[PDB]
């Protein structure tokens, strides 16, 4: 997790997938002054083991594609370092029942 | 006429004859080819 102040070189970063299995992320400075999760509208998220995942899918009979998505370069997706294939459980307030449980997979 | 419909339709109609004041109106009518034109300007006074 390198924290580039302004920007890394195009010649540079072309050596990130050159050290697999491991993976590296890049975050601009001026974009991390305030944690976005702490925000009112931003609900608390949570990851899900490939057991709890292979359960969720089974418990509702869902085919992955049938699941609400989230962009890979999404501020929260990055923040929690998601990956193409990972799920995220969202728990927010609901003026009809109190609490709803939504999930978004990271494509 | 010809393969030239690139004219303007509306001009010349079938004069109303429902009532006298109808017919009258029709002759004294003006058109205006196409949110601002539709407005009722002052100049219309």
């Amino acid at each position: 997790i390198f924290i580039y102040q302004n920007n890394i070189t195009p010649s540079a970063n072309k050596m990130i997938p050159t050290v697999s299995p491991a993976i590296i992320e890049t975050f601009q400075e001026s974009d991390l002054v305030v944690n976005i999760t702490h925000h009112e509208l931003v609900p608390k998220h949570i990851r899900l083991s490939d057991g709890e995942k292979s359960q969720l899918l089974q418990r509702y009979k869902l085919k992955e594609s049938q699941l609400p998505r989230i962009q890979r370069e999404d501020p929260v997706a990055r923040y929690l370092g998601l990956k193409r294939g990972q799920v995220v459980k969202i728990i927010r307030r609901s003026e009809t029942s109190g609490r709803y449980a939504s999930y978004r997979i990271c494509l | 006429q010809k393969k030239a419909m690139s004219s303007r339709a509306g001009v010349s109609q079938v004069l109303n004859r429902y009532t006298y004041s109808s017919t009258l109106s029709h002759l004294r009518r003006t058109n205006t080819p196409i949110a601002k034109p539709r407005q009722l300007h002052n100049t219309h006074w």
Binding site: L67, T96, S97, A101 | -
Partner: protein, 271 residues
């Protein structure tokens, strides 16, 4: 844009691709038709006046149920084992009370299925209850029964856990309203309900509830499609009778990258 959206036999809202847009229509699975504006008592007022209403202490001359309500008020008076179950309840309600203020606005009026306010006004004269002769309920009758009730307010039915969690979850708010009107203090001091009455109300709530649930098939998208546009179809570009009204809504639905009047509201810091 919503045509192919329709509730499914498990209560999921999806489309012509099966993509789940909502796991439980409206986040509760209730059909708007069967819903009315109720007022969740619990939420408003001070903890002091709250306590002076729902707090019960069988070990005290002034904060106990007057013997004009039960038929065994004195032979029940002082039981330590019961006053603990009376805490469990009250300890719950406080978890609730603080969890509901966790709607920071305070507005206690909300749309909620099963009009408990009326259903009791109905009980009032079906069995004709006098504001004179004491009721006849064990403290267990009521509390356990309302616990047994919550258990039957089933939306989802699943065997496993994941479902049963969703169950409790997308219900909760309701349950609190239920308790709010089924607290020991009120059910006995205000409307002396008999054993019969209680057994009726429950049975009806249960039945009513199950009917207030959405019916699978309901072409929801087409429904919501109109439901939204209609009170928009009835307006004037005139903002009579910042960029607002008709064009703004348009602007939004178009997901415009450059609205005329942008603006942004920021609140100060704590202090």
């Amino acid at each position: 844009a919503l045509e192919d959206i329709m509730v499914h036999y498990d209560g999921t809202t999806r489309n012509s691709l099966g993509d789940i847009i909502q796991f439980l229509y409206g986040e509760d699975g209730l059909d708007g038709t069967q819903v009315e504006r109720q007022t969740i008592d619990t939420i408003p007022g001070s903890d002091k006046a709250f306590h002076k209403r729902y707090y019960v202490d069988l070990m005290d001359e002034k904060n106990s149920i007057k013997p004009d309500v039960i038929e065994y008020a004195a032979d029940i008076l002082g039981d330590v084992e019961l006053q603990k179950e009376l805490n469990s309840e009250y300890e719950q309600l406080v978890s609730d009370r603080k969890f509901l203020r966790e709607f920071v606005n305070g507005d206690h009026n909300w749309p909620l299925p099963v009009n408990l306010r009326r259903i009791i006004q109905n009980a009032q004269q079906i069995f004709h209850l006098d504001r004179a002769k004491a009721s006849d309920l064990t403290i267990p009758e009521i509390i356990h029964g309302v616990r047994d009730l919550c258990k039957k307010l089933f939306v989802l039915r699943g065997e496993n856990e994941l479902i049963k969690e969703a169950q409790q979850n997308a219900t909760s708010l309701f349950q609190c309203l239920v308790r709010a009107r089924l607290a020991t203090r009120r059910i006995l001091e205000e409307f002396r309900l008999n054993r019969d009455a209680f057994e009726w109300v429950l049975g009806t709530i249960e039945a009513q509830f199950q009917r207030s649930l959405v019916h699978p098939g309901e072409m929801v998208g087409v429904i919501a499609a109109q439901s939204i546009g209609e009170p928009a179809t009835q307006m004037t570009l005139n903002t009579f009778h910042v960029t607002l009204g008709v064009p703004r809504l348009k602007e939004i639905l178009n997901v415009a990258k450059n609205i005329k009047t942008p603006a942004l509201t920021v609140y100060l810091d704590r202090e």
